Amino acid sequence: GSSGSSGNSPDTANDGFVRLRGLPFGCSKEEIVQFFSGLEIVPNGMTLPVDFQGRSTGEAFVQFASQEIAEKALKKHKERIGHRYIEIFKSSRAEVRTSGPSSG
């Protein structure tokens, strides 16, 4: 229960980043870009980490042109791609690790 924020204002903050969980085997942009059909995403605005050997961690970070587009994608939660439900959770560029201060 409990749902609310209060204090959002139209157009402000939030670049439109999102976090995916439970990606299919060999999940890549080619599959993502399409998975978000109708939505507009920025070029090279996607991140797909891996394990110590390079095995996808079923996680990814996409950056939408703007929040307005991010929300539209949020509704696509639990959306499976081929045979693997995908969990989408609103995220931020700052979160997306990149070996540096960008954290917290």
UniProtKB/Swiss-Prot annotation:
It is found in: Nucleus, Nucleoplasm. It comes from the Eukaryota. Residues 16-93 form the RRM domain. Signal peptide: none annotated. Expressed ubiquitously. It is linked to Intellectual developmental disorder, X-linked, syndromic, Bain type: A form of intellectual disability, a disorder characterized by significantly below average general intellectual functioning associated with impairments in adaptive behavior and manifested during the developmental period. MRXSB patients manifest developmental delay, intellectual disability, autism, hypotonia, seizures, and dysmorphic facial features. Only females are affected. Component of a ribonucleoprotein complex containing mRNAs and RNA-binding proteins including DDX5, HNRNPH2 and SRSF1 as well as splicing regulator ARVCF. Interacts with TXNL4/DIM1. This protein is a component of the heterogeneous nuclear ribonucleoprotein (hnRNP) complexes which provide the substrate for the processing events that pre-mRNAs undergo before becoming functional, translatable mRNAs in the cytoplasm. Binds poly(RG). This is Heterogeneous nuclear ribonucleoprotein H2. The lineage of its organism: Eukaryota, Metazoa, Chordata, Craniata, Vertebrata.
